[PDB]
Protein backbone atom coordinates (compact mmCIF):
# COMPACT_ATOMS: atom_id res chain seq x y z
CA UNK A 1 0.00 0.00 0.00
CA UNK A 2 1.78 3.11 -1.29
CA UNK A 3 0.50 6.44 0.02
CA UNK A 4 -0.22 9.31 -2.38
CA UNK A 5 -0.40 12.85 -1.01
CA UNK A 6 0.73 16.45 -1.49
CA UNK A 7 0.46 16.24 -5.27
CA UNK A 8 -1.76 16.94 -8.28
CA UNK A 9 -3.13 13.86 -10.05
CA UNK A 10 -4.12 13.98 -13.73
CA UNK A 11 -6.32 10.88 -13.80
CA UNK A 12 -7.22 11.50 -17.45
CA UNK A 13 -3.92 10.02 -18.65
CA UNK A 14 -4.49 6.81 -16.67
CA UNK A 15 -8.02 6.37 -18.01
CA UNK A 16 -7.08 7.11 -21.63
CA UNK A 17 -4.51 4.28 -21.73
CA UNK A 18 -5.95 1.19 -23.43
CA UNK A 19 -3.33 -1.07 -21.82
CA UNK A 20 -5.70 -1.49 -18.86
CA UNK A 21 -8.10 -4.41 -19.27
CA UNK A 22 -10.29 -3.15 -16.40
CA UNK A 23 -10.87 0.42 -15.19
CA UNK A 24 -13.91 0.42 -12.89
CA UNK A 25 -14.80 3.18 -10.43
CA UNK A 26 -17.35 2.41 -7.72
CA UNK A 27 -17.99 5.69 -5.90
CA UNK A 28 -16.90 8.21 -8.53
CA UNK A 29 -16.72 8.47 -12.28
CA UNK A 30 -13.27 8.39 -13.93
CA UNK A 31 -14.03 11.56 -15.89
CA UNK A 32 -15.05 13.46 -12.75
CA UNK A 33 -11.79 12.60 -10.95
CA UNK A 34 -9.94 15.34 -12.83
CA UNK A 35 -12.06 18.00 -11.10
CA UNK A 36 -12.19 16.46 -7.61
CA UNK A 37 -10.18 17.28 -4.50
CA UNK A 38 -9.43 14.39 -2.11
CA UNK A 39 -8.10 13.98 1.42
CA UNK A 40 -5.80 10.97 1.03
CA UNK A 41 -5.29 8.22 -1.55
CA UNK A 42 -4.09 4.66 -0.95
CA UNK A 43 -2.60 2.99 -4.04
CA UNK A 44 -2.49 -0.77 -3.44
CA UNK A 45 -0.69 -3.01 -5.94
CA UNK A 46 -0.66 -6.79 -6.23
CA UNK A 47 -0.61 -9.58 -8.82
CA UNK A 48 -3.46 -12.10 -8.92
CA UNK A 49 -4.80 -14.80 -11.20
Amino acid sequence: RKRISNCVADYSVLYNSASFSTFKCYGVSPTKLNDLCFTNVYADSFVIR
Partner: protein
Protein backbone atom coordinates in the same frame (compact mmCIF):
# COMPACT_ATOMS: atom_id res chain seq x y z
CA UNK B 1 -13.82 -6.88 -29.71
CA UNK B 2 -12.90 -5.20 -26.43
CA UNK B 3 -14.95 -2.14 -27.44
CA UNK B 4 -18.27 -4.03 -27.62
CA UNK B 5 -19.00 -3.06 -24.01
CA UNK B 6 -18.55 0.63 -24.80
CA UNK B 7 -21.29 0.24 -27.43
CA UNK B 8 -23.81 -0.26 -24.62
CA UNK B 9 -25.70 2.87 -23.52
CA UNK B 10 -24.33 5.03 -20.74
CA UNK B 11 -20.70 4.00 -21.27
CA UNK B 12 -17.56 6.07 -21.85
CA UNK B 13 -14.16 5.81 -23.48
CA UNK B 14 -12.36 6.80 -26.67
CA UNK B 15 -14.93 4.93 -28.77
CA UNK B 16 -17.78 6.31 -26.66
CA UNK B 17 -16.29 9.83 -26.80
CA UNK B 18 -14.60 10.17 -30.21
CA UNK B 19 -16.44 8.04 -32.80
CA UNK B 20 -19.73 6.55 -31.54
CA UNK B 21 -22.01 7.17 -28.55
CA UNK B 22 -25.42 5.79 -27.59
CA UNK B 23 -28.10 7.88 -25.86
CA UNK B 24 -28.80 7.42 -22.17
CA UNK B 25 -32.41 6.40 -22.90
CA UNK B 26 -31.52 4.17 -25.85
CA UNK B 27 -34.32 1.90 -27.06
CA UNK B 28 -33.41 -0.87 -29.46
CA UNK B 29 -31.36 -4.01 -30.01
CA UNK B 30 -27.60 -4.28 -30.56
CA UNK B 31 -26.35 -7.26 -32.57
CA UNK B 32 -22.71 -8.28 -32.95
CA UNK B 33 -20.72 -11.20 -34.36
CA UNK B 34 -17.04 -11.83 -34.98
CA UNK B 35 -15.84 -11.28 -38.55
CA UNK B 36 -12.18 -12.20 -38.14
CA UNK B 37 -12.23 -14.78 -40.92
CA UNK B 38 -14.44 -12.59 -43.12
CA UNK B 39 -12.53 -9.28 -42.89
CA UNK B 40 -9.03 -9.97 -41.57
CA UNK B 41 -5.77 -10.68 -43.39
CA UNK B 42 -2.41 -11.94 -42.15
CA UNK B 43 -0.69 -8.78 -43.41
CA UNK B 44 -3.05 -6.49 -41.50
CA UNK B 45 -6.46 -5.42 -42.83
CA UNK B 46 -5.90 -1.73 -42.13
CA UNK B 47 -9.11 -0.78 -43.99
CA UNK B 48 -10.81 -0.38 -40.58
CA UNK B 49 -9.75 2.94 -39.05
Amino acid sequence: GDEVRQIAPGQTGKIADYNYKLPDDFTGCVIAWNSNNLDSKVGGNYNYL
